[PDB]
Please model this.
Amino acid sequence: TMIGRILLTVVVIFRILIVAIVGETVYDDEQTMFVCNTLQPGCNQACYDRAFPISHIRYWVFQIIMVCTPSLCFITYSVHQSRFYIIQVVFRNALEIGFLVGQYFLYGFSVPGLYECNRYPCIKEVECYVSRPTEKTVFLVFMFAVSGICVVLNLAELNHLG
Amino acid sequence: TMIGRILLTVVVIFRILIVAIVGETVYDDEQTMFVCNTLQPGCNQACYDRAFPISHIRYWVFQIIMVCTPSLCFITYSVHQSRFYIIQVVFRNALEIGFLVGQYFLYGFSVPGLYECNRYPCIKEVECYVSRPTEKTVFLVFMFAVSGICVVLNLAELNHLG
Amino acid sequence: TMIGRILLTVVVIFRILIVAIVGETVYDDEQTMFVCNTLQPGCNQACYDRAFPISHIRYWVFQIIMVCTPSLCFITYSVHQSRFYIIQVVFRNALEIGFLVGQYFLYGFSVPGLYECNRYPCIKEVECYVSRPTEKTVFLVFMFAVSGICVVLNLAELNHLG
Amino acid sequence: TMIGRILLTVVVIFRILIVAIVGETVYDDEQTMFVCNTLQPGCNQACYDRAFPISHIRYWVFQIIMVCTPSLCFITYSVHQSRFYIIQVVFRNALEIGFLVGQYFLYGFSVPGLYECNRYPCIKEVECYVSRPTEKTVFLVFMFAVSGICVVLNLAELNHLG
Amino acid sequence: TMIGRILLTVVVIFRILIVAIVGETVYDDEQTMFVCNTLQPGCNQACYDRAFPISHIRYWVFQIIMVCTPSLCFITYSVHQSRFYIIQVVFRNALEIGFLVGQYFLYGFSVPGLYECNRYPCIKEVECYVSRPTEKTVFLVFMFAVSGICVVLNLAELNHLG
Amino acid sequence: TMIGRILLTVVVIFRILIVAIVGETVYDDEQTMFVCNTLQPGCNQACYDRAFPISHIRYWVFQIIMVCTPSLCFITYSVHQSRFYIIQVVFRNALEIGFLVGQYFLYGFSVPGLYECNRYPCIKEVECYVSRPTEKTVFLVFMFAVSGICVVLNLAELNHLG
Amino acid sequence: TMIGRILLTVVVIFRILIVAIVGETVYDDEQTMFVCNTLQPGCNQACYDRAFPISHIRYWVFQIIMVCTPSLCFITYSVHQSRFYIIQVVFRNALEIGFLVGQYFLYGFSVPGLYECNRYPCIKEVECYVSRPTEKTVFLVFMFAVSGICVVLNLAELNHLG
Amino acid sequence: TMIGRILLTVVVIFRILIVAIVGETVYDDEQTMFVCNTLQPGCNQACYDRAFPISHIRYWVFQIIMVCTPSLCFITYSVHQSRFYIIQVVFRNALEIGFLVGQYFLYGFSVPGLYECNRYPCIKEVECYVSRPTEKTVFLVFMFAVSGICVVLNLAELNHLG
Amino acid sequence: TMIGRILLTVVVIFRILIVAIVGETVYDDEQTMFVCNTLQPGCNQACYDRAFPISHIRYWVFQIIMVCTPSLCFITYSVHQSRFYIIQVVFRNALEIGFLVGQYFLYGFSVPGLYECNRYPCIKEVECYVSRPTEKTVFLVFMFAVSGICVVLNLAELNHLG
Amino acid sequence: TMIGRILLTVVVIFRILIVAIVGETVYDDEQTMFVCNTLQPGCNQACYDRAFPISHIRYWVFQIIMVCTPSLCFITYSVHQSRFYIIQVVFRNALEIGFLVGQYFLYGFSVPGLYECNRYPCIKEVECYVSRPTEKTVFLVFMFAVSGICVVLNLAELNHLG
Amino acid sequence: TMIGRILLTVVVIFRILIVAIVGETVYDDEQTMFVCNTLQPGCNQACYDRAFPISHIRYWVFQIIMVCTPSLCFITYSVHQSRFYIIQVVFRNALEIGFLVGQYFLYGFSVPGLYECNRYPCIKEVECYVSRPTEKTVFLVFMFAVSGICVVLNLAELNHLG
Amino acid sequence: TMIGRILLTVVVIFRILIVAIVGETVYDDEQTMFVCNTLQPGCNQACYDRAFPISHIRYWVFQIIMVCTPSLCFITYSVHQSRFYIIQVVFRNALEIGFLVGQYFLYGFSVPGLYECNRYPCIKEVECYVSRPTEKTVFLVFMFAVSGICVVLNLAELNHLG
Model:
C-alpha cells in the first residue's frame, strides 16, 4: 500500500506531461486537411461538425483539470486551518470512473479513415476523408490504458482503508 | 458558511484556467472558415461582422478581469495601511449579476449553423455557414452554469452577513 | 484624496492588462482581410496604407510605455540616493493630456466599413472593405473612456497639492 | 567507473536539449509539402498516413519521458523517507534496450525520397514525393548513435556492480 | 551632470523596450506582401533582395546587442576582482557614432512606395510595390532621434571628465 | 592573459545571443519561397533537398551545444568532489578547430541566387531561384569571423600554459 | 389594288432576306454570355431556361415557313391539273393574324438587361444579366412593324374581292 | 382523295425543312453545358452517356432518310423501264408506324431538367443538370404531331385503294 | 451621262463584294475581346452594350438590302406587264441621303481604344479597352467615301433628267 | 436478278448519305472530351493516340471513295470509245471483302468507356475515360450490317453471271 | 506576244486560287495566340493593334478585287453596245504598280518573332511574342514574287502596243 | 499506253478528293493541342514554329494547284485558236519530280511524338509533345505512294512518245 501512492503520483504526472507537450500538435490541422468529394459550398463545415462534435484534446484537458479539484479544496481548507480525506477520496473515485465511461461512450476504440455524411446543404450522401487516423487511434488507446491504471489504483486504496 | 468561501475560490480558479488554456483555440479560425454563397466582393466581411459583433472570448476575458478589481483595491489599501469589506462584497455581487444578464441578452443559449444576411454590398438576402457551432454551444452553456454558481454563492454570503 | 491614488493605480494596471492580453489579436488579420474591387496589381497596398497609416495597437503600446517614464526616473534617482515628485507629476499630466488629444485628432470615434480610395496605381476612385469595424469601434471608445478617467484623476491630485 | 556516471548525465542532457530545441521544426511541414501525382480527392491523406504512421518526433519525446520514470519514483520514495537502486537500474536498462530495438524495427536507417502507394481511394499504384529526406536521415542516425552510447554505459555500470 | 546618467539609462531602456515589443510585427509580412507587375518566375525574389538587402530590425537588434558589450566586460572584470571606466566610455562613444553614421548611409530618411528593378531574370525594367511604407518611415525617424539623443549624452559625459 | 578569458566569455555569450534571437527567422521561409521553372510535380522537393542538405541554423545550434560539453563535465565532477582542466582545454580546442574546418568544407563563403538542378523527376536540367541570398551570405561571413576569433583565443591560452 | 400585290411580294422577300442573313448571329452567344451572381452549380441553366423558353429566331423561322404553305399547296394542285384561291387567301390571313398575336403575347416590346430568378437549385432569388438587349429590342420592333404591314395588305385584298 | 396526296407532299417537305434548318443548333451545346455536382474525373462523361444514349436529331435524320427509300427504288425501276405501287405503299406505311412507335418507346413526351446518376466512376448517386429542356420538349411534341398526321394520311390512301 | 450609269453599277457591285467577303470577320471577336478593369459580375455586358448598341456590319447589311428595293419593285412590275422610272430614282436618292446622314450621326469618323463606363452594376466609373480600333476606323472611312460617291452620281442623273 | 441491281444502287446511295450528313459531328469532340486521371503533362496526348490510331470516320470515307474507282475507270473508257465489265465486277468484289475484313480486324464490335494506358510519359498505368461510347458502338454495328448486305449482293451477281 | 496574254490569265487565276483557298486559315488564330509578358489588363489589345494595324489577308483581298474593276467596266460597256482598251490597260498598269509599292512600304520582307511595345496602358516597354512567323514570311515573299511577274507582263504588253 | 491515260486521270482525281475532303480536319488542332513542360511565356510559340515551319496540308494544296497549270495554259491556247503538247508534258514531268523530291527533303517518312527544343525564350532545352502523330505518319506515307505512281505513269508516256 506504500508504493501505490507513489505510482499514482507518477502516473498522474506522466499523463499531464504527455497531454501538455505533444497532444496540441497532432490535432492542429484537423479541419484544414478534412476534405469531401463535392462542389457544394458549406458541405465541408457541416460534415466536419457532425463527424467531430468535441475534439479529443478538449475533453482530455477538461478531464485533467476536473480530477484535481478535490486536492485544491483540501489544500485550501488545510491552509485555513480525516473525514475530509475520506470524502475527497470517494469523490475522486467517482469522477474518474465517470470520465472513463464517458470516454468509452463518446469515442470508442478507433478513428476510421472514411466518413459518410448526409447533412444539409449536402445533397444526399457524400464521402469525406480524415487526417492522421492511425496516430489518433494510438493516442486513444494509450489514454484509455492510463486512465484504467488510475481507476485500479484508486479503488485499491479505497478498499485498503474500507 | 465556512465551505462557501473555499468553493468560491475553487470555482474562480477553475473558470480562469478553462478560459485561459483552451478557449483561445476554438475561435482561432472564426473568420477564415466563414463562407457565403455569393460572387460579390466584400459580402463575407459585412455578413461576418453583422453575425458576430463581439466574439465570446473577448467578452469572457473582459468579465474575468473586471470581476477581480475590488480585490486589487482592497489589497492596495491594506498594503498602504470592515466597511471596505462590506462595500467590495456589494460591488462584486452587482458586477457579477450585471455580467450574467448581459451575457444572456447578447448571445442567448445556442449558436446556429446557418445565417441569413441582407447587408450592403450583398444583393438582397444571402445564406452563410458557420464553423464549429456545436462546440461553441457547449462552451456557452458551461460558462453560463459556472457564472450562475458564482452568483448563488456571493448572494449566500451577502445574506449571511446581512 | 486617499482613494484617488488607489484608483489611479488600479486604472493603470487594468489598462495595461486589457491592452497586453487581447488587443494583439483583433488586429492580427488587418491587411490579409482588406480587399478592394479592382484588377490592378498594387492597388490594395496603396489603399490600405492610405486608410491605416499607423495601427491603433502600436499607438496604444507607445503611449502606455511613454506614460511610465517619470516613475522610472524617480525610481532610479531614489535608488542612487519632494521637488522631483512635483516635477514628475506635472510631466505625467502634460503627457497624458497630449496623448488623449492626439488620439482624438488621429482617429476620431468610429471605424467605417467602406473606404473610398484614389491613390496611384488605382484608376480613378475605387471602393474597399474593412475587417471587424464594430469591435474596433468598441475598443476605441473604451480606450478613450479609460484615458479620460486617468486625466481627471491626475488633475485632481495636481489641484489637491496646488 | 567514476567518469561513467558523469558522461551518462551529460549524454542524457545533450539528447534532451537536441530533441527539445530543433527537432520540432524539421517536421513542421511534413504533410503540407507531401504531394502525389494524381487528381483523386483523398489520395494524399491515405498515402501520407500509410507512409508515416507515427512521426519520429512523437516517438522520441515519448521515449525520453519514459526513460526518466524510475528516477522520479526513487525521488518520491526518498522524499517520503540500496535494493531500490538495483531495481531501478535494472528497469532503466530494460527500457532503453527495448526502445532502441523498437526504433530499429519501426524506421530502419534511411528515409527515401519516393514512395509507392496503393491504398483506396487511389486507383492502382501512384508515386508520391517526400520533404527533406536527407536531414531526416541524418537525425535518425544521430539519435541511434546517442542511444547506443547510453545502452553501453548502463550495461557498463550494471556489470560493474554485478 | 547628475541627471545625465539617469536620462541615459532611461533612454537605453526605452529603446530596448520599443524594439523588443513592437518592431518584430511591422516587418513580419515584408516579403509576402511584396508584389511586382510581371509573369516571369523568380523576378519577385531578385527584386525584393535588391530592394531590401538587410532588414531594419536585424540591424537594430545587432546594434542594441553590440552597444552593451563594454558594460559586460567591466562587470566580468569587477566580479573577478578607473582606467577601465575611461576606456569603456571611449569605446561606447565610438561604437554609437559608428552605428548612427552607418544607419544614415544604409537607409536614409524615407521608405518609398514604388521600386524600379532591372535584375535578371526580370526582362528590362519592372515596377514593384512595397508594404507599409509610412509606418516604416515613422520607425526610421524615431530610431534616428533616440540614437542622436544617446550620442549627445555620451559626448556630454566624455567632455565632462575630459 | 588576464583579459583573454574575459573576452572569450564575452564572445561566447555574444555568439549565443545572436544565434538564439534572430537566426530562427531569416530561414523560416526557406522552402516556401524556393521556386523552379517547371511543370513537373515533385521537382521542387528534389531540387531544394539537393541544394540545401543541412540548413545553416541546425549546424550552428549543434556546434554551439557541442562546444559547451567539457564545461558541463568539469562542473559535474567538481560538484561530486588541474589535469582535468588541461584535458578539457585540449578537447575544446580540437572541437572548435574541427567545427570551423567543417563549416568551410560544407558551405564556403557565399550563397548564390541561381541553382542548376538535374535530379529525378526533373527532366534534364532546370533553373531554380533562392530566397534572401545576401542576408544569408552576411550571416555566413559574420559567423566565420566570430569562430576564428574564438579559435585564436583558445590557442593563445593553450600556448600560454604550454 | 395592282400595286398591293407587288408590295406584298417585296415585303415577303425583304423579311426572308433579313431573317436569313443576319439574325442567326446576334443570338449565337445567347447562353455563353448569360451570367448570374452565384456559386451554386446548375443555377445558370435553370435561370436561362426560365428567362428564354423559346428563342426569337426559332419562332421567326417557324412563322416564315408556315406562312408559305398555302402557296405550295396551290402550286402542287395546279401542277397536277378560283375557289382554291379564295380559300388559300382566307387561310393566309388567319395564319398571319394568329402569328402576330402570338408574338405580342409571348415577347412584348422590349428585352430588359436584368432578370430576377427564383428556380431550384438557386437559393432564394438571384440576379442575372443579359447579352445584347438593345439590338434584340430593335430586332423585335422591326419584325413587328413588317408583320403589321403584311397583315394590312392581306386584309386590303380580302376586302377588295369580298 | 385528291387533296390527300397534295397534303402528304406538303407535310413531308415541311418536316424536312424544319429538321434541316433549325434542329442542328438547339442540340449543338448538349454536352458542353451538361454539368454534375461532383469532383470525380470522368463522372460527367458516364452520366451524359447514360442520360442521352442516342440524340434526338440523329434519330430524326435517320428516320427521314429511311422513309424515302421506296420512292428511290420505284424511280430507279421506272428509269430502267401497278403492283410496285401497291408494295411500296405497304412498305411506307409499315416503316412510318414502326418509327413512330420506336420514338414513343425511346423518348416519351418530356425532357426533365434534373437527372439522377449512379454509374461508375461516380460515388453513389449524383445529381446532374440539363440544358434547354423546354425547347427540346416542344420539339419532341411537334415532331410527334407531324408524324401522326403522316400516318393518318397514308392509312387513308391505303384504305381508299383497298 | 453615259459613263455615269456604268460607274454607278460598278460602285454598287464593289461595295456589295467588300461588305460580303471580309466585313463578317473583323467584327467576329467584338465582345469576346472586350475587357474592363473590374471584379464585378455583369459589368462587361452593360458596358459593351452601352459602347456598341448596333454593330457597324448590321447597319451596313441593312442599308445595302434597303437601297435595292425600288429595283425589285420595278422588275416585278415590268414582269407583270417612264413615270415609274422617275419615282424610283427619286426614292433611291432619298434613301441614300438618309442612310449617309444616319451613319454620320450614329458613328462619326473614328473608333477610340478606351471607353469610360458608368452603368449599373458597375460601381462609379470604370475603364474598358476595345479590340481592333484602327482597322474599324479604316473600314468606317472607306464606307463613307463609297456612299458619298454613290450620292453624287445619283444626284448627277436626277439633275440630268430634271 | 433484276431487283438486285436496284437494291445495290439504293444501298450505296443510302450509305453515302448517312456517312456524309451525320458522321462528321459525332466524332467532332473526340479528343477535347478525352480525359485521364493524372497530373503529368503530355499523358493525354499519348494515351489518346494509342487508344484511337485512326478514327472511324476517316476509314469510312476512304473506303467509300475507293469502292467507286472501277466505275470511274469504266466511265472514262466508255467516254473515250464486256470483258471490262467482268474485270471491274471482280475488282469491286475483292475490294469490298478486303475492306470488311479490315474493319473487323481494326475495330471489332464495341467501344468501351474505360481505357488502361501505359505509355511514356505516363507513370506506370493510368485510367482514361471515353466520350459517347454507345452512339459510336451503334454506328459501328450499322456500318457492318450495310457492308455485309453489299458483299452479299455483289457475290449474288458474280455467281449469276459465272 | 501571243503567250504573254495566256500567262497573264494563268497567273491571275493562280493568285486568286491561292488567296481564296488557304490564306484565310493561317491568320485565323492571329490575336488568340498573341501573348505579352505582363499582368496589366488591356496591354495585349493595345500591343496587338500597334503591331498589326491591317492584316495581310485583308490587304490582299482588297487588292485582288480592285485590280479587276477595269475589266468589269469594259464588259458592261460592251454589253450595252479600241480607245477603251488602251485606257483600261493604262489604268490596270498604274493600279498594280501602286499596290506593289504600297505592299513594300507597309510590310517589308519579314515577320519577326518578338515585338517591343510601349503603348498605354502598358508600363514602360514590354515584350510580346508572335504566332507562326515563318509561314507568314513565306506567304509575303510568294505574293511579292507573283505581283512582280504580273507587273512585268503588263508593262510588256503596254510597250508592245506603244 | 491506252489505259495509262485513264489511270493517270483517275489517280489525279482520287488525290484531289482525298486532300480536299478529309485533310483539312486532321490538322485543325495542330497548335491548340501542342504543349511543352515549362512555365515560360512564349516558349510554346517558338517551339511549335521551329518544329513545324510549313504545315503538310499547305504544301499539298500548293503542289496540287501547281501541277495543273500546263493544262490551263494549253486550254487557253486552244480556246484562242503538237509542239505545245510535248512541251507541257515535259514541264509536268519536271514539276512532279521536283515536288516529290522536295517532300522527301522537307518531311521524311515519320512524325515523332516527342520534340526537343532549345529556342529563345526557352531556357536551355525543353521537351514538347505532339498531337496525332500516327495518323499524320499514315497520311505522309499514302501521299508519297500516290505521287510515286503519278511519276511512274508520266515517265511511261514520255518514253512512249520519245
About this structure: The first strand of chain J starts at residue 35 and ends at 36. Chains J and K do not touch (no CB pair under 8 Å).
